[PDB]
Design a protein around this ligand. Structure first.
Ligand code: HEM
Length: 147
C-alpha cells in the first residue's frame, strides 16, 4: 500500500504540477488519451473522441479530487468521505456503467502526463509514489461506486 515516503513524495509532486491549475493540463491531457485508447468509455464521458474540449472539463475537475486526496493517502477518515461520495455519483451517471478496471488505467496513464509539467522533477520516487497512491485515491472512490 502507500508508504511513509510515497505519501510524502505525493504531496511533493502535487505542489508543482497542480500549483494553481490544480492539474488543469493534467486531466485534459490524461483523460484525452484514455478516451481515445478507450472508445468504450469515450461515450461514457460525453465526448466524440480524444479531440473534444469536454475532456479538459472532466480531467481538470478530476485532477482536483486527487489533489484533495493527496493530502491524506492513508488518512481515510475524510479523504474517502468525499471520494466515496464521487462513486455514489458515478453509479448515477448517464452511461450507467463506469468500472474501477478503467480507473487504474486512467490513473497509470495519468502519471505519463504528469511528467509533462515536472518532467525535470518527476523522478522514480515520484512516479512510483503517485502510481501506488493513485490506487488509493481512485480505489477509495470505488466505495460508493457501482450501485
Ligand atoms: C475510468 C473510469 C471513469 C469513468 C468512466 C468516469 C466517468 C465520468 C463521467 C461520465 C463524468 C461526468 C460526465 C459529464 O461531465 O457529464 C465524470 C465526472 C467526474 N469524475 Fe469520473 N469517471 C471515471 C473515473 C474517475 C476517477 C478515478 C475519479 C477520481 C479521480 C473521477 C472523478 C470525477 C469527478 C470529480 C467528476 C466530476 C464530479 C463533479 O461534478 O464534481 N472519475 N466521470
Amino acid at each position: 500500500g502507500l508508504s511513509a515516503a510515497q505519501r510524502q513524495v505525493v504531496a511533493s509532486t502535487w505542489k508543482d504540477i497542480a500549483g494553481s491549475d490544480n492539474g488543469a493540463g493534467v486531466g485534459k491531457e490524461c483523460f484525452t488519451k484514455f478516451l481515445s485508447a478507450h472508445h468504450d468509455m469515450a461515450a461514457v464521458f460525453g465526448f466524440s473522441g480524444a479531440s473534444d474540449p469536454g475532456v479538459a472539463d472532466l480531467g481538470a475537475k478530476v485532477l482536483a479530487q486527487i489533489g484533495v486526496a493527496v493530502s491524506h493517502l492513508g488518512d481515510e477518515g475524510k479523504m474517502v468521505a468525499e471520494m466515496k461520495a464521487v462513486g455514489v455519483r458515478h453509479k448515477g451517471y448517464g452511461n450507467k456503467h463506469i468500472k474501477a478496471e478503467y480507473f487504474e488505467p486512467l490513473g497509470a496513464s495519468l502519471l505519463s502526463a504528469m511528467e509533462h509539467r515536472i518532467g525535470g522533477k518527476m523522478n522514480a520516487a515520484a512516479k512510483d509514489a503517485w502510481a501506488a497512491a493513485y490506487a488509493d485515491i481512485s480505489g477509495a472512490l470505488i466505495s460508493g461506486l457501482q450501485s
